[PDB]
Design an enzyme around this catalytic site. Structure first.
Site, PDB file in Angstrom:
ATOM      1  N   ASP A 157       0.821  -1.207   0.000  1.00 42.47           N
ATOM      2  CA  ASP A 157       0.000   0.000   0.000  1.00 42.47           C
ATOM      3  C   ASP A 157       0.859   1.264   0.000  1.00 42.47           C
ATOM      4  O   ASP A 157       0.578   2.221   0.721  1.00 42.47           O
ATOM      5  CB  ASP A 157      -0.948  -0.002   1.202  1.00 42.47           C
ATOM      6  CG  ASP A 157      -2.133   0.924   1.010  1.00 42.47           C
ATOM      7  OD1 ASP A 157      -2.379   1.347  -0.141  1.00 42.47           O
ATOM      8  OD2 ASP A 157      -2.823   1.226   2.008  1.00 42.47           O
ATOM      9  N   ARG A 161      -0.321   9.093   0.654  1.00 42.01           N
ATOM     10  CA  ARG A 161      -1.162   9.139   1.845  1.00 42.01           C
ATOM     11  C   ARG A 161      -0.600   8.264   2.968  1.00 42.01           C
ATOM     12  O   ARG A 161      -0.937   8.455   4.135  1.00 42.01           O
ATOM     13  CB  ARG A 161      -2.590   8.700   1.506  1.00 42.01           C
ATOM     14  CG  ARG A 161      -2.819   7.200   1.617  1.00 42.01           C
ATOM     15  CD  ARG A 161      -4.148   6.782   1.011  1.00 42.01           C
ATOM     16  NE  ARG A 161      -4.037   6.571  -0.428  1.00 42.01           N
ATOM     17  CZ  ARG A 161      -3.670   5.422  -0.985  1.00 42.01           C
ATOM     18  NH1 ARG A 161      -3.382   4.375  -0.222  1.00 42.01           N
ATOM     19  NH2 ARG A 161      -3.592   5.316  -2.304  1.00 42.01           N
ATOM     20  N   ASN A 162       0.256   7.308   2.614  1.00 38.25           N
ATOM     21  CA  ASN A 162       0.831   6.402   3.602  1.00 38.25           C
ATOM     22  C   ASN A 162       2.300   6.692   3.887  1.00 38.25           C
ATOM     23  O   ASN A 162       3.002   5.873   4.478  1.00 38.25           O
ATOM     24  CB  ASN A 162       0.670   4.951   3.152  1.00 38.25           C
ATOM     25  CG  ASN A 162      -0.763   4.473   3.244  1.00 38.25           C
ATOM     26  OD1 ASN A 162      -1.550   4.988   4.037  1.00 38.25           O
ATOM     27  ND2 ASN A 162      -1.110   3.485   2.429  1.00 38.25           N
ATOM     28  N   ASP A 175       1.494   2.794   7.739  1.00 35.55           N
ATOM     29  CA  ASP A 175       0.379   1.926   7.350  1.00 35.55           C
ATOM     30  C   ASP A 175       0.827   0.539   6.884  1.00 35.55           C
ATOM     31  O   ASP A 175       0.914   0.278   5.685  1.00 35.55           O
ATOM     32  CB  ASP A 175      -0.453   2.594   6.250  1.00 35.55           C
ATOM     33  CG  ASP A 175      -1.500   3.544   6.802  1.00 35.55           C
ATOM     34  OD1 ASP A 175      -1.162   4.713   7.080  1.00 35.55           O
ATOM     35  OD2 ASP A 175      -2.665   3.118   6.957  1.00 35.55           O
TER      36      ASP A 175
END
Length: 296
Positions: A157, A161-162, A175
């Site tokens: 992932d 955003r992570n 994450d």
């Protein structure tokens, strides 16, 4: 997980009283993060309190939410400390809600961070970053991922955003709920329909469900595109429903405006149809380092 009851690990176990919860940070999907104060973490100076982030289940949690939380905890146990990875600080695992206690990043995720520093340009909508800055972001994340790969871990992932940004503007990969350990196996096979954002998924992961470090490299290419659009969203205008076909026809994103052809070539390299023909994270680190040295 509906009754794999959590064991104990005295090395990581922190009593619930030494934790004081406050403002909520992140939200949505698989869990919830709140800001908190932790009493005596490092032990050798045991009366100072540390600002930390606490991952926990949210309101209407599902089995897989819990599974993801547990897995994130254990995965971060396996990975170990690194400068570019949000590392585990502790856990509350007994007699109450599961609390995964991790490093706090004051400047939020990379997407937000980048969007907050957009110059008043026409391709858009704090203070701007130099080229060397952005390339250093790429470099840092690349270091983190190289370390991950050295520990035989797939993040799965990897996205803006992570990636979190610290007080000292350090990049730290976060994450790990979907992260998988591939010690002594060639690849990881995914469930029939995945739970990962499509626009960051490598073709072999999307269509065939094969996850390797190479697919992570693909994701990193998308992350490059995100960095040099200063927080843009991948395949702009293209709905997810229509990406599949495009990807099966060989469609690739265009060169972002303020971006050298070298870096776009790096993106395109990461986006190679054949996984084995993509650069490794080590090679990416070498390249990005070379480019950093040649930039100002």
């Amino acid at each position: 997980v509906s009754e794999y009851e959590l064991p104990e690990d005295p090395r990581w176990e922190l009593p619930r009283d030494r934790l004081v919860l406050g403002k909520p940070l992140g939200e949505g999907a698989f869990g919830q993060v709140v800001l908190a104060e932790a009493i005596g973490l490092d032990k050798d100076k045991p009366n100072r309190v540390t600002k930390v982030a606490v991952k926990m289940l949210k309101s209407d949690a599902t089995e897989k939410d819990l599974s993801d939380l547990i897995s994130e905890m254990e995965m971060m146990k396996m990975i170990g400390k690194h400068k570019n990875i949000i590392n585990l600080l502790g856990a509350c695992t007994q007699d109450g809600p599961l609390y995964v206690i991790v490093e706090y990043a004051s400047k939020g995720n990379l997407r937000e961070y980048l969007q907050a520093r957009r110059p008043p340009g026409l391709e858009y909508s704090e203070e701007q970053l130099s080229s060397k800055d952005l390339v250093s972001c790429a470099y840092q994340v690349a270091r983190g991922m190289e370390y991950l790969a050295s520990k035989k871990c797939i993040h799965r992932d990897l996205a803006a955003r992570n990636v979190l940004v610290t007080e000292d503007n350090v990049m730290k990969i976060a994450d790990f709920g979907l992260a998988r350990d591939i010690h002594h196996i060639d690849y990881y096979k995914k469930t029939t329909n995945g739970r990962l954002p499509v626009k960051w998924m490598a073709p072999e992961a999307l269509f065939d469900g094969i996850y390797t470090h190479q697919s992570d490299v693909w994701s990193f290419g998308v992350l490059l595109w995100e960095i040099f659009t200063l927080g843009g969203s991948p395949y702009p205008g293209v709905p997810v429903e229509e990406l599949f076909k495009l990807l099966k026809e060989g469609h690739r994103m265009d060169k972002p405006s303020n971006c050298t052809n070298e870096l776009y070539m790096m993106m395109r390299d990461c986006w190679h149809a054949v996984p084995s023909q993509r650069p490794t994270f080590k090679q990416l680190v070498e390249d990005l380092d070379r480019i950093v040295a040649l930039t100002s």
